Amino acid sequence: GAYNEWKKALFKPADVILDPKTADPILLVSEDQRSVERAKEPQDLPDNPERFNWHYCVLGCESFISGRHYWEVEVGDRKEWHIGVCSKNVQRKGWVKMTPENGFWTMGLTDGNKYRTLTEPRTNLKLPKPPKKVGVFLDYETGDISFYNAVDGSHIHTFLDVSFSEALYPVFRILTLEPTALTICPA
């Protein structure tokens, strides 16, 4: 459909790979750096400055300061996940709530069937179908971050008219221990 035919004409396909240096030690990054899973117990890793030590998060390797970009994530039958973008200068040590006010623009799924935006307060999304693949779209200049069902092109959510000043990284969060991973689709 139009989603498939037009996405690359309007947004540059980002080739996003996960940065293992940023990943909470309870997270596992795959060899090809496209997939993230949770471990039962934290790995023995250094608490280097780049690493999220409290939030179960991992960043992409590259950030954006301009232009239009997109990437797609296979969420599959996962019961829990959150994805989006965050500012380069988010607090990585300790906790602050994941909200736009704190530099996070994300949405996702909890408890299998509750889709929501990670806002203050959290906002419930009514989706006509559960997505299996989600497209994440950034327009830096207009300040829009949009999410689409990458299979049928349906709209999921848009953060509108954000005044970005900082560089933005793709961000991924998983809390639960389940058989299905969260996986980035290659560009």
Q: Which stretch binds Cl ion (CB under 5 A): 30-38, 94-102, 136-144, 156-164?
A: 94-102
Q: With CB under 5 A as the contact rule, which of the stretches 73-81, 92-100, 141-149, 164-172 interacts with Cl ion?
A: 92-100
Considering the complex, what minimum distance in angstroms separates the CB of residue 153 from Cl ion? 29
The only residue of 18, 29, 98, 182 in contact with Cl ion, by rule CB under 5 A: 98
- DSSP-derived pairing of the beta strands 144-149 and 155-159: antiparallel
Closest approach of Cl ion to the CB of residue 105, in Å: 13
Q: Are 85 and 170 in contact (CB under 8 A)?
A: yes
* Whole-angstrom distance, CA of residue 110 vs CA of residue 31: 27
Between 83 and 98, whose beta carbon lies closer to Cl ion? Answer: 98
Q: 115 with 109: CB under 8 angstroms?
A: yes
Give min distance, CB of 127 to Cl ion, in A: 21
Interstrand relation of 35-38 and 104-110 (parallel, antiparallel or unpaired): unpaired
Residue with CB nearest Cl ion? 98
> For Cl ion, which stretch binds (CB under 5 A), given 65-73, 96-104, 128-136, 138-146?
96-104
Q: Tell me the closest approach of the beta carbon of residue 97 to Cl ion, in angstroms.
A: 5
Q: Quick check: helix, strand or coil at residue 20? A: coil
Angle, vertex CA 103, rays to CA 91 and CA 137, nearest 5:
130
| Count, residues near Cl ion per rule CB under 5 A | 2
Provide, rounded to whole angstroms, the least separation between the CB of residue 2 and Cl ion: 34
Residue 181 binding Cl ion, by CB under 5 A: no
The overall longest dimension of the chain from CA atoms, in Å, is 46
Q: Of 15-23, 69-77, 91-99, 172-180, which part binds Cl ion (CB under 5 A)?
A: 91-99
CB under 8 A, 24+ apart: contacts of 99-104: 100/159, 100/162, 103/166, 104/171
- Chain residues binding Cl ion by CB under 5 A are 97-98
